[PDB]
Amino acid sequence: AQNPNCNIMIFHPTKEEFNDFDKYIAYMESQGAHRAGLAKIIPPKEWKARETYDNISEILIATPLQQVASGRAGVFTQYHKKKKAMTVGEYRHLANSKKYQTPPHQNFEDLERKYWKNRIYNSPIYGADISGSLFDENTKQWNLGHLGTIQDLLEKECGVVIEGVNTPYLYFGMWKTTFAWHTEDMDLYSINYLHLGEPKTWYVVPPEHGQRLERLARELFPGSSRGCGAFLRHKVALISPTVLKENGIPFNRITQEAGEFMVTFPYGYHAGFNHGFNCAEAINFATPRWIDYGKMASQCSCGEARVTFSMDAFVRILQPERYDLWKRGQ
Ligand SMILES: Cn1nn[nH+]c1CC(=O)N[NH3+]
Ligand code: NI
Ligand code: NI
Ligand SMILES: [Zn+2]
Numbered sequence: 001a002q003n004p005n006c007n008i009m010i011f012h013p014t015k016e017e018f019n020d021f022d023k024y025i026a027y028m029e030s031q032g033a034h035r036a037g038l039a040k041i042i043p044p045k046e047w048k049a050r051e052t053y054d055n056i057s058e059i060l061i062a063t064p065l066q067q068v069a070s071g072r073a074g075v076f077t078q079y080h081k082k083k084k085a086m087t088v089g090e091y092r093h094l095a096n097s098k099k100y101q102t103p104p105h106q107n108f109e110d111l112e113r114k115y116w117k118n119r120i121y122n123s124p125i126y127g128a129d130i131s132g133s134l135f136d137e138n139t140k141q142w143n144l145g146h147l148g149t150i151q152d153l154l155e156k157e158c159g160v161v162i163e164g165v166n167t168p169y170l171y172f173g174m175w176k177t178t179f180a181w182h183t184e185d186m187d188l189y190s191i192n193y194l195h196l197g198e199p200k201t202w203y204v205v206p207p208e209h210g211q212r213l214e215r216l217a218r219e220l221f222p223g224s225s226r227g228c229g230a231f232l233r234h235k236v237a238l239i240s241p242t243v244l245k246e247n248g249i250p251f252n253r254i255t256q257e258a259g260e261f262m263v264t265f266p267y268g269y270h271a272g273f274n275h276g277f278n279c280a281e282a283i284n285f286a287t288p289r290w291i292d293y294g295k296m297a298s299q300c301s302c303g304e305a306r307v308t309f310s311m312d313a314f315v316r317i318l319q320p321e322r323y324d325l326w327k328r329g330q
Contacts, residue, residue, distance in 0.1 A: 018142060039265075048139065056196075057088050059132070060088075063083070064125045075221075077180075092277055126177040131169055131170075132168065142261065147191075150286040154314070169281065171280045181270070185308070187267045189264060190263065192256070195280060201275070204270045205270075212249050230301075233300040
C-alpha cells in the first residue's frame with residue numbers, strides 16, 4: 001500500500017503533466033496522496049494563473065463576515081457576523097491596519113503559536129464564497145473555472161442527467177481568519193489556489209480516521225452534538241493541534257504559499273488559518289472514486305448548514321432514503 005503513514009505529499013508536475021487534470025489527480029492517488037486527505041501541487045515554472053493582480057481592487061465583497069469566537073484557546077466555536085459591503089481594495093487596507101495586521105514573528109512556527117494562543121481574543125473579517133474567478137480565460141491548464149463539472153461526472157458514471165452547476169468561489173482573508181473543521185459538501189474533493197498574498201496553514205485528518213475526529217468533536221462540543229448528528233457541517237468548530245495530540249487524533253499540517261494549489265480528498269477533514277491578506281479561489285470537484293463517498297456522506301438536516309441547490313440533486317440521486325428529511329432541512 002502507498003503512503004501508509006498518510007503523510008501530506010507534494011507534487012511538482014511538469015508542463016506536460018499539467019495538461020490533463022483528471023489524469024494527474026489519478027496519478028497522485030496512485031501514489032497514495034489521498035490517504036493524507038490533502039496534497040500540495042506546485043505548478044510548473046512556465047505556468048501562470050493570470051498576468052497580474054494589479055486590477056482586482058474593485059471586486060466587491062458584498063457581505064464581509066466578522067468571525068467571533070467563543071470557548072477556550074484550543075477548543076472554540078466561531079460565528080459569523082455580517083458587516084457592510086466593501087471593495088477588495090478597501091478590504092486590503094483594513095487587513096493591513098494596525099488592528100488587523102499580522103504581528104511581528106520569526107517564522108511560520110512562531111506565527112502558528114501566536115494564532116493558537118491569541119485567536120479567540122480577536123474577531124478578524126473575511127470575504128467568503130464570492131462567486132467568481134481570477135484565472136485568465138487563456139490559462140488552459142488547471143483553470144478552476146474550466147474543470148469537469150460534478151453533474152457531468154455523475155452523468156458519465158451513473159447515466160442520469162441532473163440539473164445544477166458548479167462554479168468557483170473567491171475568498172479574501174486576513175490574519176487569523178479561520179476555516180473550521182469540516183469535510184466538503186457530500187464529501188467531495190476540493191481544489192484551492194492561493195492567488196495572491198500571505199500564506200494559509202492547513203490541518204488535515206486522514207480520511208480513514210475521520211470518525212476519530214468526529215468522536216472527539218462530539219465530546220468537546222456536547223450541546224452541538226445533541227442538536228445535530230452532523231454538526232461539523234455547520235463549519236463552526238475549532239480544535240487546536242495541541243488538543244488533537246492530547247487526544248490521539250492522527251493529523252498533519254502544511255503551509256500553502258501564493259502560487260500553489262491544495263487538493264482535499266473525499267472525507268478528508270481540514271481546518272486552518274490565514275497569515276495575512278490574501279486571495280484564494282476554490283471549487284469542489286468529483287472523480288469516479290468519489291461516488292462511493294457521496295453515497296455515504298453524512299448530512300445535516302437540522303437546518304443550520306443550508307447549501308447550494310446544486311447539492312439537491314446529489315442527495316436525491318445518491319441518497320434517496322435521506323432525501324425527504326434533508327429537503328426539510330433546506
Ligand atoms: C475555501 N478555501 N480556499 N482555499 N482554501 C480554502 C479552505 C477549504 O476549506 N477548502 N476546502
Ligand atoms: Ni472561463
Ligand atoms: Ni474545505
Ligand atoms: Zn445541523
